[PDB]
């Protein structure tokens, strides 16, 4: 007969995808359209990418954004996995770019804002989309922006970097093409930068037939900047496409740029109301039960006097006043011909004594000896204490001790890096317990644990 899932029957093919192909579903009764990602069990069983697909669905499930393809449900069977998604008519942006040639400022600015709000949403949710490209972003009937593929994505862990280098050849960041560790916001921002470029010039900023010459073209911060557009965009693109990841633009830096501000709807970043729900939704854990399903009606009907509503709205007002005089919650960077700085009353004595010296924090324990030789020399000291270790990769250890005063146990991780050819650096990282009082500090126990180890490595 014909394949169908639930009340949706499978139609024409949309595309090939990463793992398995995708087709259009059609509701037997109403006629609604949904995009399904079919991942065949036989194929996904072969590879160990079972975790690759797991993380994807896990993240996309709780994702709601107008420009992020919203994952409705995921049905699966011994034959094959299915993921139904919001279907859109416009197709991929690369079809829109090529067909329409080059896009003007009024248009390009519009779309870039939508996509950047998408990746911002992702970054704030601790999930990065590594493969970014016009071939990955769709358009609805209204020719808006929709970010589609998450198969190449990853989740951002606290105090953890990403080794895997994934995505298109031209859109890959200068640090990922070289195969270097990265945080993950900066790699999407660089991919966003070349998308912004393609949204204007109609051609790719870094393009070549022969490689690594393309990657060498990428490693160098050189790219054609035609007179096509004004310098405001060029200053943006240069700051966004900066080869040095430390000098690269942040999501915030793009929000504070001039060209970006112009004609920017306030429904993208959640300060003002919604046009076409936000992080302030997580007040429930303390007050009441989950509430995500229950109080939607309590805020949909515009009833602001409900016991759940009077607990919701005042939270968004709270966060707005936090930005007002933000010098209260966060510290400010140092201050043209502008002088006056009235010091905090508790800051008065030090600046004066300085002008009527040396405090410098090192990264970690540093020593210059051989990479296999040092870890072995460390692996001696780690034992000597009576603490214990399991080794993951030759230079990466996972260690722990038993608390002497209580039956509690604290752990940590040691990852060795190479600062240069002449020297190596050993990193120390804390950890966390799995997802009633305690007479001990998890933060201090970490320091004492390192301290004991360091004392033996030094003396």
């Amino acid at each position: 007969g014909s394949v169908k899932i639930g009340h949706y029957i499978l139609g024409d093919t949309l595309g090939v995808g990463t793992f398995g192909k995708v087709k259009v579903g059609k509701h037997e009764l109403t006629g609604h359209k949904v995009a399904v990602k079919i991942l065949n069990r036989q194929k996904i069983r072969s590879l160990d990418v079972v975790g690759k697909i797991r993380r994807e669905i896990q993240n996309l499930k709780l994702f709601r954004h107008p420009h992020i393809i919203k994952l409705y449900q995921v049905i699966s069977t011994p034959s094959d996995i299915f993921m139904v998604m919001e279907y859109v008519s416009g197709g991929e942006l690369f079809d829109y770019i090529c067909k329409n040639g080059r896009l003007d400022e009024k248009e390009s600015r519009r779309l870039f804002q939508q996509i950047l709000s998408g990746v911002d949403y992702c970054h704030r949710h601790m999930v990065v989309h590594r493969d970014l490209k016009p071939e990955n972003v769709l358009l609805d009937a209204h020719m808006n922006a929709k970010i589609a593929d998450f198969g190449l994505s990853n989740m951002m862990s606290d105090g953890e970097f990403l080794r895997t280098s994934c995505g298109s050849p031209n859109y890959a960041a200068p640090e990922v093409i070289s195969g270097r560790l990265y945080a993950g916001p900066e790699v999407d921002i660089w991919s966003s930068g070349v998308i912004l470029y393609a949204l204007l010039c109609g051609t790719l900023p870094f393009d070549d037939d022969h490689v690594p010459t393309l990657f060498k073209k990428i490693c160098d911060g050189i790219f054609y900047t035609p007179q096509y557009l004004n310098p405001s965009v060029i200053s943006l693109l240069k700051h966004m496409l900066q080869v040095d990841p430390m000098k690269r633009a942040s999501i915030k830096d793009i929000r504070e740029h001039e060209w970006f501000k112009q004609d920017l709807p306030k429904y993208l970043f959640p300060e003002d109301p919604s046009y076409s729900d936000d992080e302030a939704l997580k007040e429930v854990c303390e007050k009441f039960e989950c509430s995500e399903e229950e109080v939607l009606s309590c805020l949909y009907n515009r009833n602001h006097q409900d016991p759940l509503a009077v607990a919701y709205h005042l939270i968004i007002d709270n966060r707005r006043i936090m930005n007002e005089a933000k010098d209260f919650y966060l510290a400010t960077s140092p201050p043209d011909d502008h002088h006056l700085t009235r010091p905090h009353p508790e800051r008065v004595p030090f600046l004066v004594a300085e002008t009527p010296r040396k405090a410098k924090w090192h990264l970690g324990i540093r020593s210059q000896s051989r990479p296999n030789d040092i870890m072995a020399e460390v692996c001696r000291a780690i034992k000597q204490l009576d603490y214990e270790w399991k080794v993951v990769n030759p230079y990466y250890l996972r260690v722990r001790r038993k608390n002497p005063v209580t039956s509690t146990y604290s752990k940590m991780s040691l990852q060795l890096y190479q600062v240069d050819s002449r020297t190596y650096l050993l990193d120390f990282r804390s950890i966390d317990d799995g997802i009633t009082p305690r007479p001990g500090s998890h933060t201090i126990e970490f320091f004492e644990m390192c301290a004991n180890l360091i004392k033996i490595l030094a003396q």
């Binding site: 209260f328 919650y329 508790e346 008065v348 030090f350 004594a353 009082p437 305690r438 998890h442």
Partner: protein, 300 residues
């Protein structure tokens, strides 16, 4: 009166008071006292939680008052000795400090309400209240009278505030107008420390022959002695000690008795100081209104 300001504190946790990103320093009880005080000035912090390695828990708190106590307690002369405190250690000084009386560490969970914090400040008569997560046992932040007041006025809505705030300070009877602990401009810094130990006051506004406030000597101001390595000589006057900042401070922040409470709180949080010395046309001392007064006048 208690309809709004009192309810507001009960409706919010101490969690909200904690800055988005902040610094904290802690000292092991095995550390020497001399080194601990120098570490304070290099970090700018005026308080650090005391951790015990043996007990594996936070035993207490260390503020500038401890530097004052030990300075007045062990002292002979500006030249002759310096001997007692230099070879002294935190746990050793804690021993002679607890020789007289035993007071344990007080701390509040960030999940507890702001009302529970202000209570702990008045009930225990303490300026620094460290907030510690009971689940993890980690010290997150140190609560201060300054931090609460700023948070109060900044986040409180404008409908609740107008009740008793419109009344004059004189008529409200808030603060201590009875015995004003002060020092002269020529009075040695040691006798100033002597008043700091005799009373619980956080500052000593200095006065001239007339009894007019020409400067103020806070318990914070004494840490400068450690900052400049001048703590050796305690025979110098408070004016000579405050001479370090003499070209930098604008003046002495003060108020009047006839002024409204509304005007006081706003000026007090904007100045970011801990107290104001009320005066008259002659600028002679009348009384002092510390944050403690404002905070204690709210809870009840």
């Amino acid at each position: 009166n208690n309809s709004v300001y009192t309810s507001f504190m009960k409706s919010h946790r101490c969690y909200d008071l904690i800055p988005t990103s902040s610094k904290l320093v802690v000292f092991d009880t095995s550390l020497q006292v001399k080194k601990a005080f120098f570490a304070l000035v290099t970090n700018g912090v005026r308080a650090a939680p005391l951790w015990d390695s043996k007990k594996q828990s936070f035993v207490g708190m260390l503020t500038i008052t401890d530097f004052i106590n030990i300075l007045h307690r062990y002292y002979k002369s500006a030249l002759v000795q310096i001997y007692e405190l230099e070879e002294h250690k935190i746990e050793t000084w804690r021993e002679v400090y607890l020789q007289d009386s035993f007071k344990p560490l007080v701390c509040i969970s960030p999940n507890a309400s702001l009302f529970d914090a202000v209570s702990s400040l008045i009930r225990n008569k303490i300026h620094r209240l460290p907030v510690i997560d009971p689940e993890s046992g980690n010290t997150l932040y140190i609560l201060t009278h300054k931090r609460i007041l700023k948070f109060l006025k900044l986040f409180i809505t404008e409908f609740p505030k107008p009740e008793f705030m419109s009344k004059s300070l004189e008529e409200l009877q808030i603060g201590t107008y009875a015995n004003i602990a002060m020092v002269r401009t020529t009075t040695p810094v040691y006798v100033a420390l002597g008043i700091f130990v005799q009373h619980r006051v956080s500052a000593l506004p200095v006065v001239d022959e007339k009894g007019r406030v020409v400067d103020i000597y806070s318990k914070f101001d004494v840490i400068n002695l450690a900052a400049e390595k001048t703590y050796n000589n305690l025979d110098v006057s408070v004016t000579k000690a405050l001479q370090h900042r003499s070209h930098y401070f604008e003046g002495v922040l003060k108020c009047y008795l006839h002024e409204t409470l509304e005007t006081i709180i706003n000026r007090l949080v904007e100045a970011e100081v801990h107290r104001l010395v009320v005066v008259d046309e002659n600028d002679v001392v009348k009384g002092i209104v510390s944050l403690s007064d404002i905070l204690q006048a709210l809870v009840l």
